[PDB]
Design an enzyme around this catalytic site. Structure first.
Site, short mmCIF file in Angstrom:
data_model
loop_
_atom_site.label_atom_id
_atom_site.label_comp_id
_atom_site.label_asym_id
_atom_site.label_seq_id
_atom_site.Cartn_x
_atom_site.Cartn_y
_atom_site.Cartn_z
N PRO A 21 0.85 -1.20 0.00
CA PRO A 21 0.00 0.00 0.00
C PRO A 21 0.88 1.24 0.00
O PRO A 21 1.85 1.32 0.78
CB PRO A 21 -0.76 -0.11 1.32
CG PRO A 21 0.04 -1.08 2.16
CD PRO A 21 0.61 -2.04 1.18
N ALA A 55 -3.64 2.63 2.07
CA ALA A 55 -4.47 2.71 3.28
C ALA A 55 -5.79 3.38 2.96
O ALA A 55 -5.83 4.51 2.48
CB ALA A 55 -3.74 3.48 4.37
N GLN A 97 -5.60 -2.35 1.57
CA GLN A 97 -5.34 -2.17 2.99
C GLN A 97 -6.41 -1.28 3.62
O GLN A 97 -6.61 -0.15 3.18
CB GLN A 97 -3.96 -1.54 3.21
CG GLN A 97 -3.61 -1.35 4.68
CD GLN A 97 -2.36 -0.53 4.87
OE1 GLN A 97 -2.33 0.66 4.53
NE2 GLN A 97 -1.31 -1.15 5.40
N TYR A 181 -0.54 4.00 13.83
CA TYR A 181 -1.95 4.36 13.70
C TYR A 181 -2.75 3.62 14.78
O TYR A 181 -2.17 3.10 15.73
CB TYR A 181 -2.46 4.07 12.29
CG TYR A 181 -1.62 4.78 11.22
CD1 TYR A 181 -1.49 6.16 11.23
CD2 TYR A 181 -0.95 4.07 10.24
CE1 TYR A 181 -0.73 6.83 10.27
CE2 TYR A 181 -0.18 4.73 9.28
CZ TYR A 181 -0.07 6.10 9.31
OH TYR A 181 0.69 6.77 8.37
N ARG A 229 -0.85 -5.88 8.46
CA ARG A 229 0.45 -5.26 8.60
C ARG A 229 0.65 -4.88 10.06
O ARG A 229 -0.26 -4.35 10.70
CB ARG A 229 0.58 -4.03 7.69
CG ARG A 229 2.05 -3.58 7.49
CD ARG A 229 2.24 -2.60 6.32
NE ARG A 229 3.57 -2.75 5.74
CZ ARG A 229 4.05 -2.04 4.72
NH1 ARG A 229 3.32 -1.09 4.15
NH2 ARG A 229 5.29 -2.27 4.27
N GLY A 323 8.04 -0.83 -3.07
CA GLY A 323 7.20 0.35 -3.06
C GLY A 323 7.71 1.48 -3.95
O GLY A 323 7.27 1.63 -5.09
N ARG A 324 8.63 2.27 -3.43
CA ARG A 324 9.12 3.44 -4.16
C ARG A 324 9.67 3.12 -5.55
O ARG A 324 9.51 3.92 -6.47
CB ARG A 324 10.14 4.23 -3.33
CG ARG A 324 9.47 5.04 -2.23
CD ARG A 324 10.44 5.53 -1.19
NE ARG A 324 11.06 4.41 -0.49
CZ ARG A 324 11.97 4.54 0.47
NH1 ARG A 324 12.36 5.75 0.85
NH2 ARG A 324 12.48 3.47 1.07
C1 LIG Z 1 4.20 7.39 -1.04
C2 LIG Z 1 4.16 6.27 -0.03
C3 LIG Z 1 2.92 5.89 0.48
C4 LIG Z 1 2.84 4.86 1.40
N1 LIG Z 1 1.59 4.51 1.89
C5 LIG Z 1 1.49 3.48 2.79
C6 LIG Z 1 0.24 3.12 3.28
O1 LIG Z 1 -0.77 3.72 2.89
N2 LIG Z 1 0.13 2.09 4.19
C7 LIG Z 1 1.27 1.43 4.62
O2 LIG Z 1 1.17 0.52 5.43
N3 LIG Z 1 2.51 1.79 4.14
C8 LIG Z 1 2.63 2.81 3.22
N4 LIG Z 1 3.87 3.17 2.75
C9 LIG Z 1 5.09 2.41 3.20
C10 LIG Z 1 5.37 1.45 2.04
O3 LIG Z 1 4.28 0.55 1.93
C11 LIG Z 1 6.70 0.69 2.16
O4 LIG Z 1 6.76 -0.05 3.37
C12 LIG Z 1 7.90 1.64 2.11
O5 LIG Z 1 7.82 2.51 0.99
C13 LIG Z 1 9.23 0.89 2.07
O6 LIG Z 1 9.37 0.15 0.87
P1 LIG Z 1 10.27 0.72 -0.35
O7 LIG Z 1 11.67 1.03 0.08
O8 LIG Z 1 10.30 -0.30 -1.46
O9 LIG Z 1 9.63 2.00 -0.83
C14 LIG Z 1 3.98 4.19 1.82
C15 LIG Z 1 5.23 4.58 1.30
C16 LIG Z 1 5.31 5.62 0.38
C17 LIG Z 1 6.65 6.04 -0.19
O1 LIG Z 2 14.18 2.75 -8.25
C1 LIG Z 2 14.17 3.64 -7.36
C2 LIG Z 2 14.35 4.98 -7.71
C3 LIG Z 2 14.35 5.95 -6.72
C4 LIG Z 2 14.18 5.58 -5.39
C5 LIG Z 2 14.18 6.55 -4.38
C6 LIG Z 2 14.01 6.17 -3.06
C7 LIG Z 2 13.83 4.83 -2.73
C8 LIG Z 2 13.83 3.86 -3.74
C9 LIG Z 2 14.01 4.24 -5.06
O2 LIG Z 2 14.01 3.29 -6.05
O1 LIG Z 3 1.21 3.62 6.67
C1 LIG Z 3 1.70 4.55 5.99
C2 LIG Z 3 0.88 5.48 5.37
C3 LIG Z 3 1.45 6.51 4.62
C4 LIG Z 3 2.85 6.57 4.50
C5 LIG Z 3 3.44 7.58 3.75
C6 LIG Z 3 4.83 7.63 3.64
C7 LIG Z 3 5.62 6.69 4.27
C8 LIG Z 3 5.03 5.68 5.02
C9 LIG Z 3 3.64 5.62 5.13
O2 LIG Z 3 3.07 4.62 5.87
#
Ligand SMILES: Cc1cc2nc3c(=O)[nH]c(=O)nc-3n(C[C@H](O)[C@H](O)[C@H](O)COP(=O)(O)O)c2cc1C
Ligand SMILES: O=c1ccc2ccccc2o1
Ligand SMILES: O=c1ccc2ccccc2o1
Ligand SMILES: Cc1cc2nc3c(=O)[nH]c(=O)nc-3n(C[C@H](O)[C@H](O)[C@H](O)COP(=O)(O)O)c2cc1C
Ligand SMILES: O=c1ccc2ccccc2o1
Ligand SMILES: O=c1ccc2ccccc2o1
Ligand SMILES: O=c1ccc2ccccc2o1
Ligand SMILES: O=c1ccc2ccccc2o1
Lengths: 358, 358
Positions: A21, A55, A97, A181, A229, A323-324
């Site tokens: 999410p 979420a 979620q 939360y 989660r 995610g990102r």
């Molecule tokens: C823009 C954004 C929105 C997110 N929204 C949620 C969310 O709504 N609920 C949640 O449990 N985590 C949320 N997360 C946390 C991500 O689900 C994830 O755990 C986090 O980005 C780490 O993974 P990554 O390094 O691949 O981005 C969000 C993260 C980002 C960057």
């Molecule tokens: O592929 C990507 C590109 C940018 C980025 C930035 C923050 C965290 C993860 C990322 O992954």
């Molecule tokens: O549960 C969440 C909801 C939103 C969010 C935004 C950025 C990073 C982590 C996040 O986690």
């Protein structure tokens, strides 16, 4: 391993890539729109086995911000229907979620201050929580202490949300008991100072979460994965004791019909020291998986395809959440298939793309 | 240079990145659908200054395949409206390429044989062209020689298509006079053996194209870019003579109100030797730009951001068209902004993505 399918209950994911999410903050009065439709549909076509929708608040006051998605009425749910159908048409499993932001609610969008909304801003609302204690820092608002009726009402809100999600066609549900939360805040002694049946002991602190799971299980189909989660530690200097209790609760979740646990960090309070790093959650997720005997996913830095692959081969994870990397490139699964030497990697994508990229 | 804006007539592109028309073969009886909506909207959000919609047939028989988009009725046009509006909401300029596949029509989708449809396949249709001569190879069907009334009817079809495109809200139109389809086939002596006013001399071979441009100009707004795609050589051993005539026609296009020329290869016949390579069209596009004094774009291998940047700095191109790289990664413009060291490169994307990628 990243591109081996995964079967949980009656649902089969085409690979082990999960999109977690990710809140978009683009909804209006809880209603999603074409931002969400194109965003999610595009991601589904990118090749990921599972797409979990951001979420989605079970009640208006449980939104994090004025732009958070909601599912607190049938009209809100019906808005998800075309999106679910597009995700399915793309061959991804649609999950959602469902959430309640608790004391972290009524905040600004992250690019609009990221902080609690000012008292006289007409967009804001009173927050509710286990106890009237503020998060602190950028979220200084003191929440209102929930009454027993408040607790009953929120549980029923979760039930209504799951019922709607089911009927909208979602095949995978995730209860948001993490990230500080409402659910997380009931479990943590930092935020829960209640002296009734919902506070004090481990049994009492677990109660809200366990009852909500049980209530949701009554309406959520047995043959569709039921997940949550949950932040299993805070990096607050109480990690061994906190991890022990969290793992115990994970055992109770499993016994209560939970099919998979998304393992996270609590974020219940600001005074912490989190050891951020690529795949740093790996060892924690593996310990939960082993000690509760429950499938898990986790996230943070798995956008490097080799890290995703390593986690799965080491059995730290059953699904890898990315995610990102998906905000950067909605076709990340294609990038990963190439990096990992998958046969016919372009066919991670639909024909009108795959044919030309071979 | 790649991220400098570009103003042509009343339209301003936020950068020099153009997404060229790319057929999706996902339409049904010419009608586009949610494949196209999400595909195009997702691309617009990726950051490109200009998105040109795939070849869209001005008549049923002018589709390349049973899955090609069409705009030969008002109902077909109205289907584009929500898509145009989504492209605009994303800050990209919506353009469309209008087309007639000529002797190359009635073919299979590329991943379904890529060849002319069998005679007794109920999906197929008779093709029309300047002369009854087959392309050959995988397209052996002999087209029917067009009558003067056929020619009038097709010109009016182009006018109707441009009128519809205007009213659907497109801000940029591209006449498809390239790649061996109808328009290209009228200009080339390989395929045009007519002995009337539409064949023989350079003036006569140019006539169909020039009249279609003039007719379209009557309904297409003066303040919106009017463009065409045109194959300027064939690599058929007649390149100097062909390039001279093509450049002369480009001069006539300009005098007739053409704002920009998308410079391509003709693909009029199969017996050729094209020197494929990264940005190989660069020197050809520059010669057309210089000798006709007309802005140009071109394509093939510009998905390497440094090549795109080099082409613009050398004034070979005014816009750089990037096709397949966008099927691989709809957020290619973000990838390019990073590669080229653009300040705040993540803000190539909309806030719900940009905020997190900084
Ligand atoms: C823009 C954004 C929105 C997110 N929204 C949620 C969310 O709504 N609920 C949640 O449990 N985590 C949320 N997360 C946390 C991500 O689900 C994830 O755990 C986090 O980005 C780490 O993974 P990554 O390094 O691949 O981005 C969000 C993260 C980002 C960057
Ligand atoms: O592929 C990507 C590109 C940018 C980025 C930035 C923050 C965290 C993860 C990322 O992954
Ligand atoms: O549960 C969440 C909801 C939103 C969010 C935004 C950025 C990073 C982590 C996040 O986690
Ligand atoms: C899937 C696909 C569809 C295309 N459709 C069209 C089209 O409809 N009209 C057209 O003039 N060119 C079309 N082209 C050619 C492209 O516009 C472009 O010139 C070509 O892909 C070279 O650029 P690139 O190397 O960046 O992909 C298409 C190309 C591809 C791969
Ligand atoms: O992967 C796919 C394949 C086909 C398709 C058709 C309509 C919408 C989405 C789609 O996704
Ligand atoms: O004009 C066109 C139309 C379709 C197409 C498909 C693949 C490659 C090039 C193409 O050009
Ligand atoms: O870049 C953007 C920014 C906002 C927006 C809103 C709705 C639809 C598409 C959008 O694209
Ligand atoms: O970024 C890309 C990825 C793949 C690819 C394949 C063919 C042509 C161009 C391409 O660009």
């Amino acid at each position: 391993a990243l591109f081996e399918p995964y079967t949980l209950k009656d649902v089969t994911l085409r690979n082990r890539i999960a999109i977690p999410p990710m809140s978009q903050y683009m909804a209006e009065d809880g209603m999603i729109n074409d931002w969400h439709h194109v965003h999610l549909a595009g991601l589904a076509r990118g090749g990921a086995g599972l797409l979990v929708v951001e979420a989605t608040a079970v009640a208006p006051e449980g939104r994090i911000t004025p732009g958070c998605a909601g599912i607190w009425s049938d009209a809100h749910a019906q808005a998800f229907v075309p999106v679910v159908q597009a995700i399915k048409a793309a061959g991804s499993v649609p999950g959602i979620q469902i959430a309640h932001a608790g004391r972290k609610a009524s905040a600004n969008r992250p690019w609009e201050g990221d902080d609690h909304i000012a008292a006289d801003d007409t967009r804001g609302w009173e927050t509710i929580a286990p106890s009237a204690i503020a998060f602190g820092a950028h979220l200084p608002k003191v929440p209102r202490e929930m009454t027993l009726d408040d607790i009953a009402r929120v549980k029923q809100d979760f039930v209504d949300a799951a019922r709607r999600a089911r009927d909208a066609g979602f095949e995978w549900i995730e209860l948001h008991f993490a990230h500080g939360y409402l659910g997380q805040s009931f479990f943590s002694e930092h935020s829960n100072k209640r002296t009734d049946a919902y506070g004090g002991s481990f049994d009492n602190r677990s109660r809200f979460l366990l009852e909500t799971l049980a209530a949701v299980r009554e309406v959520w189909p047995e043959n569709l994965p039921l997940t949550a989660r949950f932040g299993v530690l805070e990096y607050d200097g109480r990690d061994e004791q906190t991890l022990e209790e969290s793992i115990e609760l994970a055992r109770r979740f499993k016994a209560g019909g939970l099919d998979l646990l998304s393992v996270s960090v609590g974020f219940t309070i600001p005074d912490t020291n989190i050891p951020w790093g690529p795949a740093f959650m790996g060892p924690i997720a593996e310990r939960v998986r082993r000690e509760a005997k429950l499938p898990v996913t986790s996230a943070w830095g798995f956008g490097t395809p080799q890290l995703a692959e390593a986690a799965l081969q080491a059995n730290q994870l059953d699904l890898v959440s990315v995610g990102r990397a998906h905000l950067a490139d909605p076709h990340w699964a294609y990038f990963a298939a190439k990096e990992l030497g998958v046969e016919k990697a372009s066919w991670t994508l639909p024909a009108p793309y795959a044919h030309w990229l071979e």
